[PDB]
Amino acid sequence: LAEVQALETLLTRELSVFLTEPGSKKTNIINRITGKTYALPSTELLRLYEHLEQCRKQGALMYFLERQGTYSGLMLDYDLKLNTNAVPPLEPPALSRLCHRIFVHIKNSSVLPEGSHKIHFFFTLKPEVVQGKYGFHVLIPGLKLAASTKKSIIGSLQHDATVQKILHEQGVTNPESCLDPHSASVPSLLYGSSKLNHKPYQLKTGFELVFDSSDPDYIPIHQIKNLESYNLVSELSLTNEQGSLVRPVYCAAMLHDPEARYLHKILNLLPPEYYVEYPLW
Amino acid sequence: LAEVQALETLLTRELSVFLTEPGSKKTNIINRITGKTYALPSTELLRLYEHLEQCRKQGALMYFLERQGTYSGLMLDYDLKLNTNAVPPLEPPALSRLCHRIFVHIKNSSVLPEGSHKIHFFFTLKPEVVQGKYGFHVLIPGLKLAASTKKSIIGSLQHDATVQKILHEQGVTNPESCLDPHSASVPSLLYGSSKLNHKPYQLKTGFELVFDSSDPDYIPIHQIKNLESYNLVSELSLTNEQGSLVRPVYCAAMLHDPEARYLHKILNLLPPEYYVEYPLW
C-alpha cells in the first residue's frame, strides 16, 4: 500500500535519527510493531501525524503509542463490563454530561488559567462488545496538566456518583471500578492504533467546552461538527501543541510479531489443558 | 395573506363572544390595532397563539398585548442608552450571568416552592439601535409571581452591581436607570407584536434554569437548543399555563375611534404653530 510505503520511508530514511534507547525519558513516540522508540521534535511529530492520518483513513494496521510524561493532555481509559453484548447507546446527552462532570474535577484541581479558554473532549469507542467487555477513551489533548494533577482528577472521577449513574443507565455493571487509575501514566494509543490483538477505537463524538473565570457558572458544551476536516491523529494527540482545532491551554504545574502467519497456532495452542509440562515441554 | 385572513376569521366569527368593556380587569388580551379587549379562556388563548405564531413566522404586522394582572410570569423591560449605534454583542455568557442574578432576587423574595423546578428565561432584542437607543425584554413566563413580588424583584434588580457591570461592559451608559420599574404592571407585547411605530423584538437566546431547595448552591443554566420546535407566542406568554416547553411553577401569593380617517385632523393640527390662541381659540 502506497501510504504504508510512504510511512516506512519517513520512519527508516528520515526519523531513524531520533531513535531513543530503551527506557529513555526523551521518548515521546513508541512504534510497538517495529519495537522502535523516538524523541520527535514538534516539526517531525507533525510529519508523522500526516502519514499516520493517511494510513488511518485507509484502515492500515498501526500500533503507535505516545508517552504522556510529566506535562501533557488528559486521557481517561474506561474498561466496561456490560449487561449484554450490545454496544451501549452513548448518545450526545450522556457524553455531554460526562464532559461537564470531568470538567468539575479539573476545575476543583485549581490549576486552570484565568480568562476564557476552549477545551475539546473526544470519545473513541471499542468497535464491538466481546463477552460483555466494552471500552472508551476520553481524550482532552489540549488541556496540558501535570501528571500528579491527572492522578488527582482520575481519583476524584472514580468516586463521582453522577458518572456512576450515567454508566449504570448505559448497562455498565462495574461503574465503581471501570476507570483505569493509571490513565495518567500509561502510554496512550495514537488515534487509528491498537494492541495487535484488538481493533482501533473509533471517534464517535467530540465536544467543545468554553470556560470563563469571570463567569464560572456558564460552561457551554457543544458537539464539534466538522471533525472530518482536521487531521484526527494530530488533534487527538495528548503531546501535540501544533493542532489546528486543538490549541493548548497550559495549567499550573513488546515482542509479539504476528506478521500474518502462524496466528492459528497461537489460537489453538490454548485449548490444550497442558499448562504444566514436566515431561511434555 | 392566508394566515392573516385565518386570524381575522378567528377574531370576528369566534372570539368576538369574549370581547370585554374598556377597563374590565377580566381582560387578558388587547389587540391595539383593532382597539378590541378580550377575556380568553385557556382553550381560546391557545387557538389565538397558534394563529399569531403562523402570522409571526410570515412577518405579519401584530400589536397584541397580554395583561399581567395580579398573578402571572415575570417580564423585565430594559431601555438602554448605548455608547454607539452598534447592536451590543450580548453573547450567551453575559445573558447567562443576567439570568443567575435575576434568579438570586427571585430566590431572595422567599416565594419559590420547595422541590426541583425548571424555569425558562427568554431574551428578545430590539432589531436595531436608533440614535443609541436599544432594548431587550427578559421573559420568565412560567414563574407565576404576585404583582407585589414582581415589583419587589424589579426594585432589587435596579440596584444590582453585577447587572450594572454586565450592562456597562456591553456599552450601556444608563445601567442604573435602564430597567422600567413598571415592568410588573404594564401590558406586555406578545412575541411578534410591537407598537405601530416600532419593529417586533426578536428571540436571540433562551435558558433553562433548574433550582432544587435540597441543593440550593447548584443552579445549572443552559441554552435551550430546539426553540424553533415550539410555538414561541405560546411559550413566551406570561399568562399561558398550557405551554409544552414552559410548564408553570406556582410561587406563594382613550383615543376615540383611532381609525385615522378623522385622526388625520390629529395628524395635521400638529404642524401649525397656533398652539396658543388668544383671539383665535
Could you provide a short overview of the structure?
The structure is cut from a larger assembly and holds two copies of chain A (281 residues). Chain A has 281 residues and is α+β, with helices and mostly antiparallel strands.
Would you mind describing this structure in some detail?
- This is part of a larger assembly, with 2 copies of chain A (281 residues).
- Chain A is of the alpha+beta class and 281 residues long.
- The first copy, chain A, is 28% helix and 22% strand.
- Chain A has helices at residues 2-14, 42-57, 92-108, 147-158, 161-169, 232-236, 263-268; strands at 29-31, 36-38, 64-66, 71-81, 116-125, 133-146, 188-189, 202-212, 221-223, 249-250.
- Chain A is globular, with a radius of gyration of 20 Å.
- The PDB classes it as dna binding protein.
- The entry lists the keywords Primase/helicase/DNA-binding, DNA binding protein.
- The entry is titled "Structure of apo AsfvPrimPol with dodecamer".
- Chains A, B are Putative primase C962R.
For the sheet with most strands of chain A, the description reads: 6 strands, mixed
* Beta-strand percentage range of chain A: 15-25%
Q: Termini of chain A, distance in Å?
A: 41 Å
- Helix-strand sequence of chain A: HEEHEEHEEHHEEEHEH
Radius of gyration of chain A: 20 Å
Task: Give the proportion of residues in helices of chain A.
Answer: 25-40%
Main interface by residue count: A-B, 5 and 9 residues
The total strand number of chain A stands at 10
Number of helices of chain A: 7
Looking at the chains present, what oligomeric state does this protein adopt? Answer: part of a larger assembly
Described by the principal axes of the CA atoms, the overall outline of chain A is: globular
Structural class of chain A: alpha+beta
PDB class: dna binding protein
Keywords: Primase/helicase/DNA-binding, DNA binding protein
Entry title: Structure of apo AsfvPrimPol with dodecamer
Chains A, B: Putative primase C962R
